[PDB]
A paper describes a structure:
Transcription and translation are central gene expression processes subjected to extensive regulation. Significantly, we find that the ribosome increases the speed of transcription at the expense of decreased fidelity by exerting mechanical force on the [name] and by allosterically inducing an active anti-swiveled conformation of the enzyme. Our work shows that the coupling of translation to transcription prevents prolonged stalling of [name] at the expense of transcription fidelity through a combination of force and allostery in vitro.
To establish whether the ribosome allosterically affects [name], we used cryo-EM to determine the structure of the [name] harboring a terminal rU-dG mismatch at ES56 in the absence (RNAPFree) or presence (RNAPTTC) of a coupled ribosome. In this TTC, the 70S ribosome and [name] regions were individually focus-refined to 3.8 Å and 7.3 Å overall resolutions (FSC = 0.143), respectively. In the RNAPTTC active site, 9 RNA bases are paired with the [name] up to the i site, leaving the i+1 site empty. While it is not possible to assign the ribonucleotide identities in this structure, but given that we had incorporated three terminal phosphorothioate modifications in the RNA to prevent their hydrolysis, we conclude that RNAPTTC is in a post-translocated state in which the rU-dG mismatch is tolerated in comparison with the RNAPFree, in which the polymerase is backtracked. We compared RNAPFree and RNAPTTC by the alignment of their corresponding core modules and observed that the RNAPTTC swivel module is rotated by –2.3° relative to its position in the RNAPFree, a conformation that we denote as the ‘anti-swiveled’ state. Moreover, when looking at specific regions within the swivel module, the β′-clamp and β′SI3 regions appear rotated –2.6° and –3.6°, respectively. We propose that the anti-swiveled RNAPTTC corresponds to an active polymerase since it can overcome and progress through mismatch-induced pausing. Our active anti-swiveled RNAPTTC state should allow for TL folding, which is hindered in the swiveled, backtracked RNAPFree. Strikingly, for RNAPTTC, β′SI3 exhibits an extensive range of motions along different directions, displaying up to ~45° of inward rotation to adopt the ‘in’ position that is conducive for TL folding. The map, however, lacks the resolution to assign base identities of the RNA-DNA hybrid within the RNAPTTC to confirm that the terminal mismatch was indeed tolerated and retained as opposed to being removed.
Author numbering:
A (entry chain D): 253 to 905
B (entry chain C): 2 to 890, 913 to 1342
The structure:
DNA sequence: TTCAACGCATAACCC
DNA sequence: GGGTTATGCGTTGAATTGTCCGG
RNA sequence: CCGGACAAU
């Protein structure tokens, strides 16, 4: 690059070479004047460090420089490392063919379409416009074709819209945590200036919804579509690779909509009186006559595919809430109606759709689960959520608890000064009693926060499940952890003191009344450490991730059967308490090594090398056999790889 | 009774603990820092005089020529403080120094032919303070952030743990002079101690002391006890001491009164302490074998045989004992080596050193600094008087001298700047004592162990280094020069000093570029305290300790302010009540109490005094003059809430406001929400930008006036009084003649500030809020600046709220805003941009400025002049040309308008050097610029003349006055009357002569306003002209906006909803915004609902006053309800009563209350929830304050009432513009078709690493030869896609990459060959 | 011009 | 004279955005 | 074209 003038600025590779050639000129010139052994000894040193300077420095002594105190940029600086070509050209380069816009929620796209705005959908596909003008003849030369696009009167977008459905593009999210961040959404040309994403997918990436970053990728050839029908889309990749739980986690605003829905009252509005129609009970619901928690039974028809896909023509009239039937009429074919009778929280709803995939199927279940957000939006619109002071109830015995708590401190300190106890064990005693002195208040606020809402009963009073607003999402699992609820009414506990150990003076009040500066300072003092350490643990995690991702990548499967009928010994490991993991998550879809025999009567359970997907393991779990013998990945006779039988089925596939 | 602005609009304040003092100004770290930097402060004390104290002596060689210093002064610079910034030049006042130079004749130390007195020698210029306390370097003023660093001197830390896998406990003694070389000492795991230099190779410390004109005995006689033995014919009696047997087990028989008390194999205990100290007999029967159990101190000559018995520091042996016992030598002192009494550390380090003498003790120091050179006495000593005994390389200030005095428990205060033998031995003794059984270590994080440095010392250091590098210049030019036949102007020049002093302020770590987007950000930047810089804490080097701060900083630093991201806790500030001493250590005031009586006296206390002394608590129950009625009061001594008694406290905290300064002190009730989950909103005001219209907060704290007048954006009446006239350019104010002087009383000048663009496209504007005929006083705000109204502060504005997630649109943090703002266009400001059009004379045809520009349209000639310059007020679109400029070859190389940043041309600025012919447009521009000056000075001249008319006629009537010479007389001849000659006559003459002088005094600057304005500026050689345009773009509310309030409402806008879909209520009040009460546990944010009702309370009062005044009831209702609406609160420290004032003040102040009643609620000493309910009951509001809401879609009730109310919301800076970008394809790099970097001018975009390998992991194998092969590397494949897509075919065969093969080319030069084969 | 964690490497060093 | 251990120094340390100036 | 500094997730 030049400079501000007639001269030209030099580079790092040339600054030092300028001086070494200039000094070499006079060293070589002095050779003709019968130079002694000193000039010839010294002139070789300068060329030795000049040649080392260009190659690499900072190994012997202080590295030389020609610009500033900062070291020069050698030839091995832009090739390797963080800023090297290896990690800069293919691993974080400046990509093309993409535009930047602000992300909105926009709960309109479901799985197939998107919310690509009109301008963003017009400013990208440049050559396809010229590729489609000449078909009807609007343009015969590219030169004149150029000067009818930049003005965009009425014909730039209608032409570019019909090439959209014939070529799907790819959308991925830059702040992606999982592996399946590549989802196929067809482009659209709609009004607005923002991009909308599926609310479940938006929370699926687990990124802050505050001006994040998008990235658009388009296939660049025809053959990028015939094979692009089974790999890079979420239609078939619902199961998560990491765990048996699919990527479709129930939303927090629908779990409460079903948890409070399944709540059963014993005496409220609409109680006792039973209708003769699910749809008429639904009408009496939003007409202002029936409650969401109510006891009304209606003729609900159930079906089962226990046969060869044949509907079991049956019905039932059981005492249900008003919205369970509403959900039931969403079942397109029919499922055993007993499957929808629960608390409907996190795990219950999660294994609703999880078993629904395996019962009804994959394609219809996708729609059935994608409509969960749609059907819970009615609940969100009709109830919503709010918080207030009235949800705060101070425990009635807390002030007595705090009054009596400090008494033992003085009663033992006076013994310490009287020569009865010693501070060496007295301090440990104090920090131990105060480590649990918060627990009595913690369970004293149970009987002051979660036990209030009563109802009448035929003229008397009946106490039933609490209807505390912050407890609705608490017990339903939508939001609100145990470590956070204590921070509201109870005591947050004893944190680490600046010395390092537990504090000696616990927290007296909560964040709802006055608090002194000294202890609020102590609480913030303990608090900033997590925010400081998250700046470093994430970086350390990235170090190990990179050290473990680029090493196991070189693998190829070259054989189908390894020819080995052996493997490992499978038995739920257990030590101490209960066993946490069964064989179900251990072996799921794996080709058996040999025929497992029944321990009791020596009965062949699996006849030969077969998979173990659902019912084989259901046979194992009912026959109580712990003599499972399946092919093991470590013990495989495959040259440079592992056969398909030692690994078997894989998740997300 | 309040100030006129306060009486105009007085805000209600609450509190139960009265305060005694007000809030001082926070701009005490730059103006005060620089004023002492440039002043006549002899002996230096960190000032330019300190720079001169090193260049005051100047003894030249071969002649003893003396160049002494007399004085320096700085006058008015050639450029002012308001036009140099516009021109774009360097602001520097003339640093002129009166130097007297007496060049003595050679050889003679005394004698001069003639003394040469240099009047104000020109060594260069240094910046001054323009109007705010900042530096101006290159056009934009520069603010150097104050740096945090460690204290100059010695530190004692533990730094245990990793001890070369040994685990032995170790300590260290790190020394740091003021600016010299570092003597950092530490210990070894092998029980040793030595010396080190500047964190470098170890140096033996048991040989250098002998090298410093010492010997052997002074080493061994000062670190051990002396125990005299007795040499007789047998068994070698010897004299012990209890100071030796205190821990040394006497394993020998000790007789006393003819009986042995302590013999072999027993330990002396307390009973034996009596059995021994009660006798202490010295003539005991010591055995011969216990004599060998000692270690000799030095050499002893055998008095019987003259044989070398022992040399030094060696264990005695029985044969040695029998080798000296055969004499009469009764004087044998020995050492005392122990493991728990004395450190056994200088027992072996003597033998560790290879030698210890005069000669070989210096070859080690010669070879450690200059290998390959024969040792020399003078060269070896030179380092000793260079790094330890010097004044220009190694020296310490008074701070460094006295810190060691306190660190080593001394009594003296002022000494030298050099290390002393006593100090360097005491550091080797108290330090070795730290290990054995005593001592303590000092933490670096402690406030007293770090030093704060500012511009006042960094500039002094730079100028003193600048003077010391030129000090020897005169010595060497006068060593072989003339005989004082010159003038001290030539050899001591200005270019290098002025360039180094200027560059040292602009190109530096601390020279952070100013970001002017908020006056609160202006003060936050000025009070920003950073750690990085020269000799500080680097970001890469950071452990878990430097990241944690010493907890003893409450009331001294603001804790709620904290940086996030790469640095945590690195940015600091200064508390309100506390201040940094010149020593750099912090101290905070406290109220001087006695044991029983509370005095209002205030003293300054710090952490070192706090450690031992016990401080009481502020919110302690008080009554009359002050008595703690409570006995057991929560005290503190080491940060712990110690519960101590009542009669030992002499100080509590002055106030609760000493902890927080600027971070989030404007947000009441900071205790409800933790700063951990509130700093994401408390850190966004440093970048927030003011909007067009701003409303007064309904709820605050009360410290908004001091911070408003503190910021330099208002127009305070520095000389208030009588207000005469208010103008849109200058508020014409003056005071009565009685308060100013008979000579040039003058009028009060208050120039009004117009719209500008400082650093961040910020348009500042001031509007005169005062009326015509409203008196003011000293220190009274006159013209409201940005985000100010009626003399108060209002950054943001107020709007009502609802808590109802509608249809789940606020999923995580999104917000729903209706069409109530996009049609009003009120929440937006004006940004003025700038593009520079370079007129560089290119080769083969320069760049010309003319309207004859090819490839234009007929619309251009209407908006462009005949010279190519756009008309003033002619709008531009995407693709227009501001100034016509072509490069003949011809192509239009002028500036184009990119699409998306189109605005309006309001200012066109042309900078041209003197010598280049200008166009008619530009000539007319300065033509009008000169004539506006004439008229704008003329009205000022006339109003000054009229004011002096009032002053003189006023003195004329007061005393002698003539009816004939009263109104018809000329207004100039007012010094010729019948008044007799007295103090009145001579005062009248003085007034007249001053009037005459001032009638022509203006002509000097009148003349000055040409030879500096008509002349062209200078930017750089080699360019024809630089012309700039200050285009301004106004944006509206569009999809992509961002929401960020003071409460921390961090969310992005989702979409737009109709006002009809917006839910109404029982009366249909349109709710402004609705939040998402979903993140309460994730974001613990509760302390807003309680303060929400204050908005209803204020609106309720405002509307009640409005309705009550609409019908205009009698004064028996107006002054009654005003009384009741202003009398409220249970225990308030503010007493406001408008009814007792005049009726006019009643109406003129009630008219200011149409929307709400301002409320000042401090966090601790303010209005509580009980105040909330009482005020809700003062009007017609429910006790609970809960309002039921209706449905806008289905028209019903949902299940519950919804809290609704107003808070105070404020706008951030980033909306959509810093992130919006769009690009498809075009130009790329030069070496290949790689897209450039960044989205600002032109470049590619970010993408992560995980998708890079996710696509490879997929079965699709074509995903790799598509993204980085035929998109960024294949040049002809790029042309292939260009040529074939426009035909319609969509298929490109990949070619070859141009990145993998390029690397092999440069390795081929190293001898690498490549072959291609297919199996 | 103050690292921390991890780990192969000469030159000595122990009875 | 084989094996253990004291001691110097090799390598590295997240995603890049946004914008300012400075060679 | 390479860095410093501030700010953002
Ligand atoms: Mg975000
Ligand atoms: Zn196998």
């Amino acid at each position: 690059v030049p400079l501000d003038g007639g001269r030209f600025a030099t580079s790092d590779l040339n600054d030092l070479y300028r001086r070494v050639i200039n000094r070499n000129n006079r060293l070589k010139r002095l050779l003709d004047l019968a130079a002694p052994d000193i000039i010839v000894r010294n002139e070789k040193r300068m060329l030795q460090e000049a040649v080392d300077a260009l190659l690499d420095n900072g190994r012997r002594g202080r590295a030389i420089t020609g610009s500033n105190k900062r070291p020069l940029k050698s030839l091995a600086d832009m090739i390797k490392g963080k800023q090297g070509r290896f990690r800069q050209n293919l691993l974080g380069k400046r990509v093309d063919y993409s535009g930047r816009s602000v992300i909105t929620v926009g709960p309109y796209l479901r799985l197939h379409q998107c919310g690509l705005p009109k301008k963003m959908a017009l400013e990208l596909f440049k050559p396809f416009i010229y590729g489609k003008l000449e078909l009807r003849g609007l343009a015969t030369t590219i030169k004149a074709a150029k000067k009818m696009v930049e003005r965009e009167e009425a014909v730039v977008w209608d032409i570019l819209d019909e090439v959209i459905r014939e070529h799907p593009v790819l959308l991925n999210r830059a702040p992606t945590l999982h592996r399946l961040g590549i989802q196929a959404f067809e482009p659209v040309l709609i009004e607005g200036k923002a991009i909308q994403l599926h609310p479940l997918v938006c929370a699926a990436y687990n990124a802050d919804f505050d001006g994040d970053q998008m990235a658009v990728h388009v296939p660049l050839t025809l053959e990028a579509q015939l094979e692009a029908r089974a790999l890079m889309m979420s239609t078939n990749n619902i199961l998560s690779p990491a765990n048996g739980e699919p990527i479709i986690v129930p939303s927090q605003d629908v779990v409460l909509g079903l948890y409070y829905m399944t709540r059963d009252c014993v005496n409220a509005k609409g109680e006792g009186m039973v209708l003769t129609g699910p749809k008429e009970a639904e009408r009496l619901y939003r007409s202002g006559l029936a409650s969401l928690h109510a006891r009304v039974k209606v003729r609900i028809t159930e079906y089962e595919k226990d046969a060869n896909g044949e509907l079991v023509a049956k019905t039932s009239l059981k005492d249900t809430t008003v919205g369970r039937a509403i959900l039931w009429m969403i079942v397109p074919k029919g499922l055993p109606y007993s499957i929808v009778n629960q608390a409907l929280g996190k795990k219950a709803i999660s294994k609703m759709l999880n078993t629904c995939y395996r019962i009804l199927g994959l394609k219809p279940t996708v729609i059935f689960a994608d409509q969960i957000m749609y059907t819970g939006f009615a609940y969100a619109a009709r109830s919503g959520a709010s918080v207030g002071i009235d949800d705060m109830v101070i425990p009635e015995k807390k002030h007595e608890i705090i009054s009596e708590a400090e008494a033992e401190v003085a009663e033992i300190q006076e013994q310490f000064q009287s020569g009865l106890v010693t501070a060496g064990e007295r301090y440990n005693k104090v920090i131990d009693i105060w480590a649990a002195a918060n627990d009595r208040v913690s369970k004293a606020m149970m009987d002051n926060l979660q036990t209030e809402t009563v109802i009448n009963r035929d003229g008397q009073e009946e106490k039933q499940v609490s209807f505390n607003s912050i407890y609705m999402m608490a017990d339903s699992g939508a939001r609100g952890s145990a470590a956070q609820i204590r921070q509201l009414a109870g005591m947050r506990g004893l944190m680490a003191k600046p010395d390092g150990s537990i504090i000696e003076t616990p927290i007296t009040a909560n964040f709802r009344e006055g608090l002194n500066v000294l202890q609020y300072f102590i609480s913030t003092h303990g608090a900033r450490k997590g925010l400081a350490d998250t700046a470093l643990k994430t970086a350390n995690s990235g170090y190990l991730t990179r050290r473990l991702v680029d090493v196991a990548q070189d693998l190829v499967v070259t054989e189908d059967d390894c020819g080995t009928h052996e493997g490992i010994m499978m038995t739920p490991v257990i030590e101490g308490g209960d066993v946490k993991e069964p064989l179900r998550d251990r072996v799921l879809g794996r080709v058996t090594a040999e025929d497992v025999l029944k321990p009791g009567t020596a009965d062949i359970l699996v006849p030969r090398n077969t998979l173990l997907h659902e019912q084989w393991c259901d046979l194992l779990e009912e026959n109580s056999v712990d003599a499972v013998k399946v092919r093991s990945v470590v013990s495989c006779d495959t040259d440079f790889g592992v056969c398909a039988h030692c690994y078997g089925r894989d998740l997300a596939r | 009774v309040y100030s006129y602005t306060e009486k105009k609009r007085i805000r209600k304040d609450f509190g139960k603990r009265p305060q005694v003092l007000d809030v001082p100004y926070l701009l005490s770290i730059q103006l005060d820092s620089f004023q002492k930097f440039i002043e006549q402060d002899p002996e230096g004390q960190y000032g330019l005089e300190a720079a001169f104290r090193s260049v005051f002596p100047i003894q030249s060689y071969s002649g003893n020529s003396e160049l002494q210093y007399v004085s320096y002064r700085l006058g008015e610079p050639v450029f002012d403080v308001q036009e140099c910034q516009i021109r774009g030049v360097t602001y520097s006042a003339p640093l002129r120094v009166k130097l007297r130079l007496v060049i003595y004749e050679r050889e003679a130390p005394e004698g001069t032919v003639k003394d040469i007195k240099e009047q104000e020698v020109y060594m260069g210029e240094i910046p001054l303070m323009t109007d705010n306390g900042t530096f101006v370097i290159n056009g934009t003023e520069r603010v150097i952030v104050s740096q945090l660093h460690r204290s100059p001197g010695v530190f004692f830390d533990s730094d245990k743990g990793k001890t070369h896998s040994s685990g032995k406990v170790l300590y260290n003694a790190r020394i740091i002079p003021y600016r010299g070389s570092w003597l950092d000492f530490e210990f070894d795991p092998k029980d040793n101690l030595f010396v080190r230099i500047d964190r470098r190779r170890k140096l033996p410390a048991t040989i250098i002391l002998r090298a410093l004109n010492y010997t052997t005995e002074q080493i061994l006689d000062l670190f051990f006890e002396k125990v005299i033995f007795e040499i007789r014919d047998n068994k070698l009696q010897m004299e012990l001491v209890p100071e030796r047997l205190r821990g040394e087990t006497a394993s020998f028989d000790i007789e006393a009164n003819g009986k042995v008390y302590v013999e072999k194999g027993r330990r002396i205990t307390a009973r034996h302490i009596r059995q021994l100290e009660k006798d202490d007999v010295k003539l005991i029967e010591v055995p011969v074998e216990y004599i060998a159990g000692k270690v000799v101190a030095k050499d002893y000559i055998d008095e019987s045989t003259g044989e070398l018995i022992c040399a030094a520091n060696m264990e005695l042996s029985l044969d040695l004992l029998a080798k000296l016992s055969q004499s009469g030598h009764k004087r044998i002192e020995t050492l005392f080596t122990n493991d728990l009494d004395h450190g056994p550390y200088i027992s072996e380090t003597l033998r560790v050193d290879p030698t210890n003498d005069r000669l070989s003790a210096l070859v080690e120091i010669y070879r450690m600094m200059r290998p390959g050179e024969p040792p020399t006495r003078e060269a070896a000593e030179s380092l000793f008087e260079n790094l330890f005994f010097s004044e220009d390389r190694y020296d310490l200030s008074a701070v460094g001298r006295m810190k060691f005095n306190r660190s080593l428990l001394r009594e003296e205060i002022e000494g030298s700047g050099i290390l002393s033998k006593d100090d360097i031995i005491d550091v080797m003794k108290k330090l070795i004592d730290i290990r054995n059984g005593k001592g303590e270590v000092d933490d670096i994080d402690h406030l007293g162990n770090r030093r704060i440095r500012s511009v006042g010392e960094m500039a002094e250091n730079q100028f003193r280094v600048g003077l010391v590098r030129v000090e020897r210049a005169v010595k060497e030019r006068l060593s072989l020069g003339d005989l004082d036949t010159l003038m001290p102007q030539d050899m001591i020049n200005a270019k290098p000093i002025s360039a180094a002093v200027k560059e040292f302020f602009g190109s530096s770590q601390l020279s952070q570029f100013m970001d002017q987007n908020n006056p609160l950000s202006e003060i936050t930047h000025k009070r920003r305290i950073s750690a990085l810089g020269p000799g500080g804490l680097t970001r890469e080097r950071a452990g878990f300790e430097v990241r944690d701060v010493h907890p003893t900083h409450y009331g001294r630093v603001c804790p709620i302010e904290t940086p996030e991201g790469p640095n945590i806790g690195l940015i600091n500030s200064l508390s309100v009540y506390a201040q940094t001493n010149e020593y750099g250590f912090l101290e905070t005031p406290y109220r001087k109490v006695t044991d029983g009586v509370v005095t209002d006296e205030i003293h300054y206390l710090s952490a070192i005094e706090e450690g031992n002394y016990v401080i009481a608590q502020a919110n302690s129950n008080l009554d009359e003059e002050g008595h703690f009625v409570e006995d057991l009061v929560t005290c503190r001594s080491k940060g712990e809430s110690s519960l101590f008694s009542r009669d030992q406290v002499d100080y509590m905290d002055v106030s609760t406001q000493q902890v927080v300064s600027v971070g989030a002190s404007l947000i009441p009730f900071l205790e409800h929400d933790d700063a951990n989950r509130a700093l994401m909103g408390a850190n966004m005001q440093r970048q927030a930008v003011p909007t067009l219209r701003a409303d007064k907060p309904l709820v605050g704290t009360g410290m908004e006036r001091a911070v408003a007048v503190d910021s330099g954006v208002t127009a305070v009446a520095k000389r208030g009084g009588v207000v005469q006239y208010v103008d849109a350019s200058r508020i014409v104010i003056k005071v009565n003649e009685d308060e100013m002087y008979p000579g040039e009383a003058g009028i009060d000048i208050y120039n009004l500030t117009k719209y500008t663009r400082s650093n961040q496209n910020t348009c500042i504007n001031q509007m005169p809020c005062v009326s015509l005929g409203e008196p003011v006083e000293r220190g009274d705000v006159l013209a409201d600046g940005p985000s100010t109204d009626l003399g108060e502060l209002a950054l943001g504005q107020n709007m009502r709220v609802a808590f109802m997630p509608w249809n789940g649109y606020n999923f995580e943090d999104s917000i729903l805003v209706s069409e109530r703002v996009v049609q009003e266009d009120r929440f937006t400001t004006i940004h003025i941009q700038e593009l520079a059009c370079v007129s560089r004379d290119t080769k083969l045809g320069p760049e010309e400025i003319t309207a004859d520009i090819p490839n234009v349209g007929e619309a251009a000639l209407s908006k462009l002049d005949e010279s190519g310059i756009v008309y003033i007020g002619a709008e531009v679109t995407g693709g227009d040309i501001l100034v016509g400029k072509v490069t003949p070859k011809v192509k239009d190389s002028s500036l184009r308008v990119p699409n998306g940043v189109s605005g309006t041309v309001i200012d066109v600025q042309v900078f041209t050097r003197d010598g280049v012919e200008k166009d008619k447009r530009a000539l007319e521009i300065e033509e009008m610029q000169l004539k506006q000056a004439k008229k704008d000075l003329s009205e000022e001249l006339q109003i000054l003349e009229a004011g002096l008319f009032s002053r003189i006629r006023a003195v004329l009537v007061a005393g002698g006055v003539e009816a004939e010479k009263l109104d018809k007389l000329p207004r100039d001849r007012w010094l010729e009357l019948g008044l007799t000659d007295e103090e009145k006559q001579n005062q009248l003459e003085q007034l007249a002569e001053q009037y005459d002088e001032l009638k022509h005094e203006f002509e000097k600057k009148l003349e000055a306003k040409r030879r500096k304005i008509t002349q062209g500026d200078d930017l750089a050689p080699g360019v024809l002209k630089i012309v700039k345009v200050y285009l301004a773009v106004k944006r509206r509310i569009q999809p992509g906006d961002k929401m960020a309030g003071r409460h921390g409402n961090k969310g992005v806008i989702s979409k737009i909803n109709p006002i009809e879909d917006m839910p109404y209520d029982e009366n249909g009040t349109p709710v402004d915004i609705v939040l998402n009460p979903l993140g309460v546990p994730s974001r613990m944010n509760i302390g807003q609902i309680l303060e929400t009702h204050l908005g209803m309370a204020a609106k309720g009062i405002g509307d009640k006053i409005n309705a009550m005044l609409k019908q205009q009831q009698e004064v028996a209702k107006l002054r009654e309800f005003i009384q009741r609406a202003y009398d409220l609160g249970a225990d308030v420290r503010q007493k406001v009563d408008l009814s007792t004032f005049s009726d006019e003040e009643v109406m003129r102040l009630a008219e200011n209350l149409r929307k709400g009643m301002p409320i000042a609620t401090p966090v601790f000493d303010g209005a509580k929830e009980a105040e909330i309910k009482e005020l809700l009951k003062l009007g017609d509001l429910p006790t609970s304050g809960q309002i039921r809401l209706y449905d806008g879609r289905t028209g019903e009730q949902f299940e519950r009432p919804v809290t609704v109310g107003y808070m105070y919301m404020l706008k951030l800076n980033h909306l959509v513009d810093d992130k919006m970008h769009a690009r498809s394809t075009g130009s790329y790099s030069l070496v290949t078709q790689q897209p450039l970097g960044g989205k600002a001018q032109f470049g590619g975009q970010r993408f992560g690493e995980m998708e890079v390998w996710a696509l490879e992991a997929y079965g699709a194998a074509y995903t790799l030869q598509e993204m980085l092969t035929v998109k960024s590397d294949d040049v002809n494949g790029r042309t292939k896609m260009y040529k074939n897509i426009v035909d319609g075919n969509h298929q490109m065969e990949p070619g070859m990459p141009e990145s993998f093969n390029v690397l092999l080319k440069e390795i081929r030069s190293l001898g690498i060959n490549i072959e291609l084969e297919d199996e």
